[PDB]
Enzyme design. Structure first.
Site, PDB file in Angstrom:
ATOM      1  N   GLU A  55      42.562  44.659  25.455  1.00  0.00           N
ATOM      2  CA  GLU A  55      41.324  45.245  26.123  1.00  0.00           C
ATOM      3  C   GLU A  55      41.682  46.584  26.770  1.00  0.00           C
ATOM      4  OE1 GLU A  55      41.246  42.001  29.088  1.00  0.00           O
ATOM      5  OE2 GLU A  55      40.258  40.569  27.726  1.00  0.00           O
ATOM      6  N   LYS A  93      39.150  30.798  29.727  1.00  0.00           N
ATOM      7  CA  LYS A  93      40.185  31.944  29.410  1.00  0.00           C
ATOM      8  C   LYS A  93      41.439  31.652  30.429  1.00  0.00           C
ATOM      9  CE  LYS A  93      40.494  37.024  28.573  1.00  0.00           C
ATOM     10  NZ  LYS A  93      39.527  38.010  28.819  1.00  0.00           N
TER      11      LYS A  93
HETATM   12  N1  LIG Z   1      28.252  45.147  41.388  1.00  0.00           N
HETATM   13  C1  LIG Z   1      29.330  44.503  41.471  1.00  0.00           C
HETATM   14  N2  LIG Z   1      30.060  44.575  42.530  1.00  0.00           N
HETATM   15  C2  LIG Z   1      31.163  44.085  42.659  1.00  0.00           C
HETATM   16  N3  LIG Z   1      31.614  43.014  41.893  1.00  0.00           N
HETATM   17  C3  LIG Z   1      31.059  42.769  40.865  1.00  0.00           C
HETATM   18  C4  LIG Z   1      29.557  43.501  40.458  1.00  0.00           C
HETATM   19  N4  LIG Z   1      29.129  43.123  39.365  1.00  0.00           N
HETATM   20  C5  LIG Z   1      29.944  42.030  39.004  1.00  0.00           C
HETATM   21  N5  LIG Z   1      30.918  41.977  39.832  1.00  0.00           N
HETATM   22  C6  LIG Z   1      32.277  41.082  39.938  1.00  0.00           C
HETATM   23  O1  LIG Z   1      33.022  41.364  38.513  1.00  0.00           O
HETATM   24  C7  LIG Z   1      33.701  40.203  38.146  1.00  0.00           C
HETATM   25  C8  LIG Z   1      33.461  40.256  36.830  1.00  0.00           C
HETATM   26  O2  LIG Z   1      33.739  41.358  35.667  1.00  0.00           O
HETATM   27  P1  LIG Z   1      34.084  41.451  33.877  1.00  0.00           P
HETATM   28  O3  LIG Z   1      32.896  40.752  33.563  1.00  0.00           O
HETATM   29  O4  LIG Z   1      34.410  42.885  33.926  1.00  0.00           O
HETATM   30  O5  LIG Z   1      35.040  40.218  34.063  1.00  0.00           O
HETATM   31  P2  LIG Z   1      35.695  39.716  32.557  1.00  0.00           P
HETATM   32  O6  LIG Z   1      35.697  40.593  31.673  1.00  0.00           O
HETATM   33  O7  LIG Z   1      34.719  38.405  32.280  1.00  0.00           O
HETATM   34  O8  LIG Z   1      37.064  39.124  33.236  1.00  0.00           O
HETATM   35  P3  LIG Z   1      38.665  39.245  32.691  1.00  0.00           P
HETATM   36  O9  LIG Z   1      38.870  40.768  32.195  1.00  0.00           O
HETATM   37  O10 LIG Z   1      39.312  39.169  33.978  1.00  0.00           O
HETATM   38  O11 LIG Z   1      38.738  38.325  31.460  1.00  0.00           O
HETATM   39  C9  LIG Z   1      32.980  39.242  38.810  1.00  0.00           C
HETATM   40  O12 LIG Z   1      34.150  38.684  39.734  1.00  0.00           O
HETATM   41  C10 LIG Z   1      31.801  39.509  39.484  1.00  0.00           C
HETATM   42  O13 LIG Z   1      31.516  38.871  40.632  1.00  0.00           O
HETATM   43 MG   LIG Z   2      37.433  41.919  31.101  1.00  0.00          MG
HETATM   44 NA    NA Z   3      40.455  42.382  33.337  1.00  0.00          NA
END
Ligand SMILES: Nc1ncnc2c1ncn2[C@@H]1O[C@H](COP(=O)(O)OP(=O)(O)OP(=O)(O)O)[C@@H](O)[C@H]1O
Ligand SMILES: [Mg+2]
Ligand code: NA
Ligand SMILES: [K+]
Length: 393
Positions: A171, A70
């Site tokens: 989003e 991404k």
């Molecule tokens: N319980 C938690 N505490 C802290 N951090 C967490 C926890 N669970 C997941 N994360 C962190 O959250 C992040 C992933 O978040 P998420 O799945 O919302 O991102 P994404 O939607 O894939 O990213 P983007 O929106 O930036 O494209 C990772 O950095 C992960 O280590």
């Molecule tokens: Mg996201």
């Molecule tokens: Na984000």
């Protein structure tokens, strides 16, 4: 025909949801998980693995296990972000003949949509297995900051996956649609604070009910595309490298295998510290020389982690102030704050957001699922499982 599935195509994790009448459902994958790592691996025997099976073999197949696509999709090779990534990523990032940022695996040059399409194919198959029928239509989310090239490249990934992309939705707006199913009636103004694995976004969104329609309008948006959970991981990785050097006199940064193991261990410890006050990082045989093998064993407290990332959390506040200014609102005009993104589960993040607004974020929005659910809601608006919803310019 069939259902229009909603897909959150994330930097770190992707997920898929459907509407069952008025009830959204986030679907578990073949591994039993409601989220899928956005990781695509091309194995020696010629298989393509996606998600946890790809994550599990990354250490033994580092050049052919792709992630963070991404960050490349829709970008030019000489984009500053891409040039940073060329140096840090373990897989090969190259210039296409037309100047776009591409990847190369075992001599095969591929455009980023060809890689993200493998994640989308897994989301499609997940929904087909659950539903018992073919799935050919989808709503896919993108960050609000994405430009036309990034939006078109995401649409192309859907087409490569065999999906008719009925809509691209931003989003923050998807999160607002998820909130808007179980919200109070009438006028509401919300702040959507989305801290994911790659980027940070704050959006101020107004909901109204007028002439039989529920309307949604983005009043302001701001963010930081270099502020995400991967940056929190990096601070903890650096601490572990420094502590190991101080104690054992060896710099692990020269060893790609050790650094890949530290990245995994750091992320695991970070997540553990969202619910525990301390944790231990243990990595046997992290390095070895003629004096003998070396094993890492480092205790990390929540206080230590908070000190390592305090400035990252503080960097999320200035955009909040600007977004309110741009919307012409003060903090007392906000009716609810919605946390989105896995990294918002960190207690320090929750506390800093509540302190800024003077009120606790909603508890009935799942920060890991809201975006996918909102994409599914948009799909229901297009079909008719959901009625009377309007997105205003
Ligand atoms: N319980 C938690 N505490 C802290 N951090 C967490 C926890 N669970 C997941 N994360 C962190 O959250 C992040 C992933 O978040 P998420 O799945 O919302 O991102 P994404 O939607 O894939 O990213 P983007 O929106 O930036 O494209 C990772 O950095 C992960 O280590
Ligand atoms: Mg996201
Ligand atoms: Na984000
Ligand atoms: K996600």
């Amino acid at each position: 025909s069939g259902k229009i599935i909603g897909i959150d195509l994330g930097t770190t994790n992707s997920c898929v949801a459907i509407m069952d009448g008025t009830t959204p459902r986030v679907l578990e994958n073949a591994e039993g998980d409601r989220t899928t790592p956005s990781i695509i691996a091309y194995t020696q025997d010629g298989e393509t693995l996606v998600g946890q099976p790809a994550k599990r073999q990354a250490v033994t197949n580092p050049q052919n296990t792709l992630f963070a696509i991404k960050r490349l999709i829709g970008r030019r090779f000489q984009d500053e972000e891409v040039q940073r990534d060329v140096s840090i990523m373990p897989f090969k990032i190259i210039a296409a003949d037309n100047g776009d940022a591409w990847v190369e695996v075992k001599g095969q040059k591929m455009a980023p949509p060809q890689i993200s399409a493998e994640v989308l194919k897994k989301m499609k198959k997940t929904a087909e297995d659950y539903l018992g029928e073919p799935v050919t239509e989808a709503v896919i989310t993108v960050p609000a900051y994405f430009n036309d090239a990034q939006r078109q490249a995401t649409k192309d990934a859907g087409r490569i996956a065999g999906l008719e992309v009925k809509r691209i939705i931003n989003e923050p707006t998807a999160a607002a649609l998820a909130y808007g199913l179980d919200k109070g009636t009438g006028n509401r103004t919300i702040a959507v604070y989305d801290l994911g694995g790659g980027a940070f976004d704050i959006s101020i969104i107004e909901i109204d009910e007028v002439d039989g329609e529920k309307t949604f309008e983005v009043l302001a948006t701001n963010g930081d595309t270099h502020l995400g959970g991967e940056d929190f991981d990096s601070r903890l990785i650096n601490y572990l490298v420094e502590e190991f050097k101080k104690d054992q006199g060896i710099d692990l940064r020269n060893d790609p295998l050790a650094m890949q193991r530290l990245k995994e261990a750091a992320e695991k410890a970070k997540i553990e510290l969202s619910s525990a006050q301390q944790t231990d990082v243990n990595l046997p045989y992290i390095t070895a020389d003629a004096t003998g093998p070396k094993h890492m064993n480092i205790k990390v407290t929540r206080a230590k982690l908070e000190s390592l990332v305090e400035d990252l959390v503080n960097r999320s506040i200035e955009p909040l102030k600007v977004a309110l200014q741009d919307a012409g609102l003060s903090v007392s005009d906000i009716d609810d704050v919605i946390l989105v993104g896995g990294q918002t589960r960190m207690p320090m993040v929750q506390k800093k957001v509540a302190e800024f607004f003077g009120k606790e974020p909603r508890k009935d929005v799942n920060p890991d699922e809201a975006v996918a659910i909102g994409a599914a809601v948009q799909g229901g608006v297009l079909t008719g499982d959901v009625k009377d919803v309007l997105l205003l310019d």
